[model samples]
Target chain A: RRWVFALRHGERVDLTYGPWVPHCFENDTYVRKDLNLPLKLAHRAGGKGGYVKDTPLTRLGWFQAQLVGEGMRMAGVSIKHVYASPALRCVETAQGFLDGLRADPSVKIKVEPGLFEFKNWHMPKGIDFMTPIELCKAGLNVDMTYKPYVEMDASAETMDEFFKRGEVAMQAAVNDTEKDGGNVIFIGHAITLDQMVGALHRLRDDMEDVQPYEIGRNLLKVPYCALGAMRGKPWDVVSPPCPPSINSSSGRFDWRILI
Target chain B: RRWVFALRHGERVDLTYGPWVPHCFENDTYVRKDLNLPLKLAHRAGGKGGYVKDTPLTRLGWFQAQLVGEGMRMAGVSIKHVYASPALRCVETAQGFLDGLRADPSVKIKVEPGLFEFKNWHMPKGIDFMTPIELCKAGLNVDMTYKPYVEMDASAETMDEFFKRGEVAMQAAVNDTEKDGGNVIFIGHAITLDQMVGALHRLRDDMEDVQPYEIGRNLLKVPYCALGAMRGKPWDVVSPPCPPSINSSSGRFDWRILI
Candidate 1:
């Protein structure tokens, strides 16, 4: 059996409150202090093109890692191997989580370039000379209008195209875990994670044709680390006798809150 | 104050009675396994050509290292730096001592090409193909008429010249200790060690005379890991007052004893 856990980068300097006013989508409740799961998609914590590659783990990020580590420990999740995107921020964030785990020697962290954030989605444009903090602030604007500035002269991936790439990356990760069983954590962006999950849902044939409102309520309303265990064939999202609750406090979100 | 300790390489594979008699020179009473400390005086441990080159440590050599390590540990002689001759045997012996010490992470071992046994004292002619055991049985007989084969091809050094070279090596090592503020261990052979100690004695003007007998007694008669602390204006040999006793308890002599 394979278990996969998806985590979003912790409170980014760029995303907290900038050009984009936090909008509540689906089951997400946008409290100024706390953001709900499902809405928490993994993003480049820090990378060459990430908002602030040099910006190390923010205080909130550290808290998140500690919380995630504690939750995993409580759940008796033995993380055997770690594959990280080469983003500096992701490495820093992963280190935080590892530190929370008291730096277990048995677990080795490896960098996977393939797991890097989709280049076409938010490629930095020509002669870029923005400081890490400025980049973070600029990345906060999620509006499509900001895409040109984010991509500069580089080619950009349409929303759908980016989602497809995410699917490929996610599928590779899942297959890797299937062959080698253990708890695996994938640090990604909010949109990338949602699309990957959607792809997984589609691949498993477990996704039902629900209205937008119902879909948002069922999947996007929870915290990112809020886990969902799949039982049956790979990607088959079978409905158990009891549907897992989507609330952040329903134990799932509780474990993910720190991250 | 700078302190340095020099040691000869352990047993080798070629020599008459090498198998029967222990490679390490023992005292007349056989109470102590002795070291040939007289500098520039070539004395083989019953090996061909009156000496062995690139020899590995024998079982007794390893035991000596352990005893030395224990003695140093008891003496609180924390070695901060270790420099070894490039000879295969010397390197091996140094490694053995290092293993016994379980050297701290801060302490590093380095190989130095300048320190080696005196080339002059080694027999002018080299021995024909013969195992260390054979050489031991042959004893001084091999040294009398063997044609010396130069392995690394180091030119022979007279007693005075060897002593001068040794002084330079010893000074360099002492300077290193002064700068690093820790003990240093130099792994060489009898001639080199003798030259170093003799120079040290003269430079410090500590003893009435630096004789081969005195050097031999201080090195061999003393216990393994014996420390001769350099103190005051004229250097004095202090510490490691108790020496180790080795006798028939070890074993009977065999031709391949050194092997």
Candidate 2:
């Protein structure tokens, strides 16, 4: 049996930097802080790309890399295969976290196009929404009753398509992990992450709901860096019961908002 | 000059399997489904103390240690004089992360009581409280919050006393790091971390608001590990900063969370 772990991307420029006001409806403040875990995610302070699209991590991001590196040291997630999205941000994010893993040349990270941000899910095509925030809200299924925003314009792949890509990416990661016999980290975006969790839920009937939006609705706005795990073959829909301890304690580990 | 890193203990059985329920405030949920990362802070999932009062790492906690060890490899955080809280959890967390470093035998970790949870800031005599959360929220000043339920009954230390003990412990570590010509990791709790940061901040006027509460409230919560740089002399603080390109990006790293 193989164990697989997946995480949504850390907070991004759109949420952190200015010119772009935070989405009024979502828990922007909490998202901003929680996603900035220097140990696990990148630090956005003291660098370029404050509001710039797809900027590399700032100095703060580097600090985050160090913190995460230290955290990994504390955890024992050593020497494993790596897979990440090809986007500059994803690549950068993957590198930041991978730096902490400190795997030797034998264990390097690879970019996977399947892990890229959902082109279909983004604005102009999926939904002709005015802002990324609006698009993200809908894509994430955030509550719109609180604030009114433009609806999506073009429809991207249905939820099913999103899940399929996640499945594909996960299958690749799992195969690689099994071949190498170690743990793996799959870095990507929230929507893509949603699809991945949905896929895992489908495959592992015993696995409870891993939905961040549903779980963090009251506590936080966005589920920054929520994680999910799976054991056994990716194709096998069912496996030994999800670790009971993991299931029982999942709620406390969710870092929806910083507060 | 010496560089120093401070860390909270890694996850433990008491934290994951004790009487606690996980962090539940109002209706907000900070924890979610991530088998790799567990909530180290808070009450619900696991109460304050159990297996070890300061319990050792659980299987998952051990994984965190390896991850952090690998992270140290990536960041090049060489361990010279590793100091930990007298508590068992700190020892276990330090040991787990140490395993990943694969350091030379000369750099063994040592335990010290001065680095234990903040003895200062305990509630005035005869303060009644139910949960550690209540005691923490009510007893400690806003600047020194992170009091686990387990410590609720323990006598709180005055701010001055806490700072002195922390300074002594840290200065000792700093001295050792200087002798070894390497960095150090001091494993303890958030409150104790704040005292150390406060001491360092006082020493370096530029480091105002470096305490854990201030850092936690203002900066991204970096998790079980919070890093600090120490040079032999105070003048080292003014040394030229490291170049940007040399730094890594965020979201690329993985971190271990100690609740």
Candidate 3:
């Protein structure tokens, strides 16, 4: 089936796609020494850096993300709130994306606890990571602020766990309004990206209407920083689409799908 | 079993239960007429009297409700919103109750359709009633505005029917709010009153901590405008009791219950 990109932000966007919570980080070789990575990301293998611990995204990773920021800005995406993975690469990705989204340094990023890569039996348990505030205190100079943690410490679980955490993460993006009528954005790993999709399908069958395709049928297919969109839908209403089919039993809606 | 009076409204503490929908010209017996009863009572019962009919509240009904209104006000109750049963008696009951509660007609009431008397082999399918706006146009003079009607006609039904309509009734009182604080009020019937309680029990289990009493136990015991209070509880916090009991569930909350 065919689909189209029809929305954007709510911090506030006039678009149908959320343009919310974009996960954009890919790690590298040389063990990109950003130990500040959250426990889950730090303990895992990095791309190209195979098996090396705590690798951060490369400098090229930084350069590649600029296009995403520029793309978001050019699309007129109004990202007032940003949630970042506590890993260095994602943090760096967040910083660069915002610069491109709107180079206003005053834009604050919140390094969320639940926005982490899903862990498996191979990783056993995910370790705790540094807060954005911690990195700032460590002189990384990123202007984001951090709040004290909630008990959201789990990162080693199955798809169900990802769906659960992703629900929480996406809701925060949906509800937050640091600036009225603006949008909230996110940065995380590929696995971190689909939890909402994972959780949404588990919703009541009495709910779902038609979407051209299933969730994750497209969203999980991108390369690093492959920016996509999400929106919400209410029942009896056409299911809103984007990279994935999302749930909206709450009436908040899902993303607009793109072909 | 301890129970508390939670809410009330209508007119100044000087009137009867409902001088509003008197349906007073009881053609079968006597014209229960007294159009001059707005201070305490008056009116007609133009049904029996029907293959189709609308029963409005009476005037003495209004006067009798003063104590209810006064009682609410004296208790320092803050009724921020009200959902009225579209029936003539209950519409006036709500208006009079608010008068006594706040001694002012400025508090607007929304006529709710589902608040009705029970339907069985005897009462048959109940007829649809007036909207808040309809009563205003009919010369009842209550300042509350009404929109063109949605499904809100009867106040009674069987178990499953109660579950269906009652759910909406209870939620309106519980969820509609303009601020972070205050209460919602419901002016319904013997059948309708139980539905709020009826619907409450069908709620989820993960979030409730106390109030083990069933809903109908006490509410069904009151007379017309016989007043009571309702409170809400959410897990990890004391539920706000009064207007409605609603919690989105962290897998959280209790079945909607009554005392």
Candidate 4:
């Protein structure tokens, strides 16, 4: 029996930096004003429209991932293999987690597009995440040569197809390390976290186990950098290396005053 | 009517870096390992024992505060005055928030001792926090000359006394900025977030609204950098410039495997 760890990405530039893109970009030209802002954003197919779809992780996001990694290391947990969604935030978070674990240099992050978030939920333009090779060229420690376990434009798929794809990708990730029963980690969206764990528990096909993604709610109400672990033969939910929740929020504004 | 913002500190070192103290400190000599750990911790009455009582803000904590400040700035809100609890985490958070707002350099953080958390809850040996002068010497942008509006050893006082002190400190923070009805902010603990806001709402001296502080619950269930704002004639709650909550938690381990 081994452990499977899953986490949502850390704070993103778009959500935290509500006015970042417009402030930092000028007609396709960008100037990085803050250290928290990403060094470079992933290429989006929709030009300006892609900004929201392909937003990058903030510096805090990196620290959050690192903190989780460090906590796991301190707790005597070691990850043998790591998988992440092709999303820029997930990829960067994986790298940060690896940095925190101080993991072996040879352990590269595997990009699994199957682990992408709920398709047809937010992607009106169809998902066009960066490929593993593209990620490698962009200076990330990605296993560019490794072919995706499942290849499908989830952006156009139905909920059932998306879950099945998630299940297959998760199974593949587990099977890769099954020989040694080594621990594994998957970095993805909030829904991906649920799908990965839910797959193991045999969540119903009716989607009762998975919560529908809500709009306007941050990270689908699953806090950024949320980590969950399951272990043993039955693969039941277990405590993660770090605390389950941080319990922080930004101040709210009075919209009624305008009304 | 003016706006008042209250926030719990961002992530703290002890919580994020669980094994940090032993790894970073040896017999009062400290070596900073990661960027998240604080540069220095405040001096406690007890030597090595002071670590928990006066833990500093993690780098993530600083970023969290900065994000809140930036969001407020972007939301067309301008803070005219700032107050913080004497705790190291709160003070550092206040500074980070100031950095994020990019507020006028002349605006210094007022350290309010009464803004401290449930006095009798955590401290057994009576709290001994660093003085404002010491904080100024440490290079923080603090108003050393400004006297604490309320000063008493509430750490040894009863719950009622603590709440009253909080109310007074909160009132003082407001009184300082009431003249022009400019926005105000107070940085403190999780319960302090409750008290600061509750004080405005007239929380009972019986402590009905305020939740009891729990041990090992992670910020007493309040996420780090939780920001809440209030405004209008009667002083009702309002949406903050930033999201009220970021749902995230560290994973937990299953101890049943060992058994």
Candidate 5:
């Protein structure tokens, strides 16, 4: 076998991350990229005051999130809670999609620290944030709730750490609000998501470490707001491609979600 | 001085927050508080990730908002834009009210930073928050969309400063998008609401400094999702209240809005 595990002629593993993941372990997740907004809305770290902020989604970003929601609705993905990144673009993506995903906008969506990107230092305390009691309060104060799981917590010197962080975040996000519905939507950066699924599915194993460029697929770039998940388990080699977009004319992000 | 500047026998000033405001300023308003939830769902101040969030409106909060919208439908105050507080509860409060307030969720409510409470420290530059842009993005990153107008910007130590903050903020809020219609809505905290109007009407100049306890009068507290605005202006004290609720059995706020 090229890797540690062996595969039969046509058998597949399951490393699913959302809705019905446990019930349909055979099926996996459909991870969507945040939105089409061109602006970069991230927080300024170690900042000392008020109003100094980040970029938000463009009007374009709004429609992208809406399309994702519409597609999810068409696909029948009734969500419990949508776990999101606090980034501005990602935030709109979640909201727009939720507007279309549910019949009403009452379903709660939270920002998960575990849903954030790989970082080198541990997240600071007091000056800005604290740990989240549940997903609900996480977004209430992006600066406050959710402890710093990574960031200043650890140094990222190797691919092992990055992938490990990705997996951990993914697992936490997947399990966030299980009772709401098995389906959970994780909205965030493309690179981190690539690392997340890559870690979960073990996309490749030739090199000792995974570099930034090698994320997802070195051959193709992960498109803007692309939604994909490994179909099988921890050791799965292959799985079905992304689900068909039941509502979008673009088809499984074949188009849109651009900068 | 027929209907002009005539002060009544007990002539008190009318500095109402929204909806009617005496009809003197050529504008009208509808104000609603965030939620019926009595707990806190604030941000963690200095969270490590992109979004560390919080609890939203309770089911009761949702119904209250809906009832407010339903009642408004009968007495009707059309809206051009909705300005909301960035708090988790306030976000949902605006969302819920809009659900029944308007026919379309896509009208796009802009996140006006001026609408938030008077805070200290200038909101930090990055890490996790900033001023919000669109409704979808505003709630998406609750921590960031709301910038502190006073807390960090300046200390609200003096009744002068507090009332000034209230007047300045209220003016900006009213001018935010005043063209479409004379009617607007300012949905936020009760104390802040009291401050905004108290400053507008000069609630009590006798007190050197307004302690938190004396915010709104004991006439009656602002109820959960309660919507009220003087039917008359910037100066007149007498104005008719909103027509009674057409649906809720308890008449206009004669019933619910319990904590």
Candidate 6:
């Protein structure tokens, strides 16, 4: 049976650690307020502002991805192809998953801009994301040699444009992996879970009546480290190799509001 | 001021995964029943009997240790020395903590038989534990050059003997770390928590009136991944650098007895 897996990245440092940058960043020096925060931020085009868009995954986030990969390996599923959104979170998730998968470091992940989530959400302050070169230099197991499957638009994408991009990206990943004749996995954000599944259904002509945008609208509910799977030639959505939630909680304190 | 940290190892695979060996160990070959279980079990002298005594930590267990280490690093606690019980779970927990601590790979953990828990509990069969050389071969960061502070008796010991061993071990670790003039950490079983602390208090002569055996009796209550800290030349027990519980729960199913 054929399989495709889509996963959301683990917990982010900024959200989990809570205003940590303010606590530690002073006098143009960045000392870690928490050891779980990235030892070094991803290299960006300019300023620490890049941290807002390209924050690295926290330690728990990395562990969550590895746990998911372990689930896949335990189930005896072998993945032949892997792709991740270009975001730092997605890239780091892929790296952790590969470790859990016990796949060789030689199995470099293909970073695809097409898998990036909605651009309109961050409209005015456009994302200054880390390029494939930057990610490679950051010591991620990224495929620096592979050409991108699709070019991401610098401008904010409309809802229709976003759906089209998702459909095209999913098709490329599937087509590439089908040649190798094994399973494939995509590591991305919350939106990618629904977006990729909808695209696969469209490609198989199995859920032709339902529009991709209809599926993408409810994408916010996708939980972190959630794994979604589709199996067989008919593209039937099946239970993932691992349970969706691996029991994770972010204990970052909010001083302003007491809980 | 000098500081020492004593930690309980993370979740054990046997207790967390629930009778998993029966499900996967068949036909003289072992297949993983779950991904969270160790991909490779630590080597032991006897048959699979060793697994009962030398179970490895689950993925969550390893993560818990790393999280604790991360907390230490965030708190700016630089540990100059490390030690662990020869048990696989304790060694693995120390390895994970070092990773979280971001300490150099050159910092090897001193595997001390003196740190092993009360042997009388496992009386008849006796533990077929892994040696330091075996641990290093298993890819752990174990110190091959360091000699144990005290040798373990193969035979079960009385309560008095156990307390004496604990006192000596704690003294040795403290004496060695004081020379380095930085913090030290001991990763071991639940009993090690109360046993080590009681030993330190006795060493300082502050709590000389309270017998070590009195402190050792209540050792069973030490929680997994719990961190106990002692500070100052006087050895006042202080709050650990990290919170005791990092929010972990084992979801292993028990088919024999339903909850």
TM-score of each: 0.33, 0.42, 0.34, 0.54, 0.32, 0.66
Task: Tell me the docking grade of candidate 4.
Answer: incorrect
DockQ, per model, reads 0.00, 0.06, 0.01, 0.08, 0.01, 0.08
Q: Candidate 1's residue-wise lDDT over B29-114, tens digit each?
A: 12112111111112335342334433434444444455455456655667776766655455556656666566665454455555
TM-score of 4: 0.54
Candidate 5's C-alpha runs over 4 A off are: A1-259, B1-54, B103-107, B118-159, B175-181, B199-221, B232-259
Model 3: CA > 4 A from native = A1-259, B1-54, B125-128, B138-158, B178-180, B198-221, B235-259
- Residue A226's lDDT within candidate 3 is 39
Could you tell me how far off, in angstroms, the CA of residue A202 lies in candidate 3 after the best superposition?
93
* Candidate 1 wrong stretches, greater than 4 Å: A1-259, B11-53, B125-153, B205-229, B232-234, B249-259
TM-score between model 1 and native: 0.33
lDDT of 5 by residue, A13-88 (tens): 1101112123221223221121111222223342212111223343334444554465556545465545565444
Candidate 2 residue-wise lDDT, A1-259, digit = tens: 5555554544354444444223211332312222122222232331123224443333233333333444555565563655655444444555656665565645544555566554444343211111223322312211122221111223465544545556676655564457667766666665544444455555545556444222222332223343444445543222212211220111112112221
Q: Write the per-residue lDDT of candidate 1 for residues A1-259, one digit (tens) a residue.
A: 4445444445343433332223322333322222211122233332333333333333344445445555456446566545444444455455556665564755544444334554454455322233333323533211122211012223565544555555666666566556667666655443333444454565554457521212132333233222233432364332211111110110001111111
Compared with the true structure, what per-residue lDDT tens digits does model 2 show for residues B1-259?
5565566565555545534324221244434223323334333223332222434454445544555565666555566667766555566567666776777755555656677665435334322222333323422111122222122235786655555666776665565446557666677765544455555556666556654433234343334433333343562322111100111112211222100
CAPRI accuracy category, model 5 = incorrect
Q: What CAPRI-style quality would you assign to candidate 1?
A: incorrect
- In order, the Cα lDDT scores of the candidates are 0.42, 0.44, 0.43, 0.71, 0.38, 0.73
How close to the true structure is residue B7 of candidate 1, measured as C-alpha lDDT? 58
Which structure is stronger by DockQ: 4 or 5? 4
Q: Taking the tens digit of each residue's C-alpha lDDT, what string does model 4 give over A1-259?
A: 6788888898787777667778778878776555456645655445555665687787667878887787777768888788999888999899989998888877899998888876674456535577676677667789857788987754466777777888899877776677888888999987666666666665334335544433233333466787777885566777665543342333322323211
Candidate 6 DockQ vs. native: 0.08
Worst 10 residues of 3 chain B by lDDT: B245-254
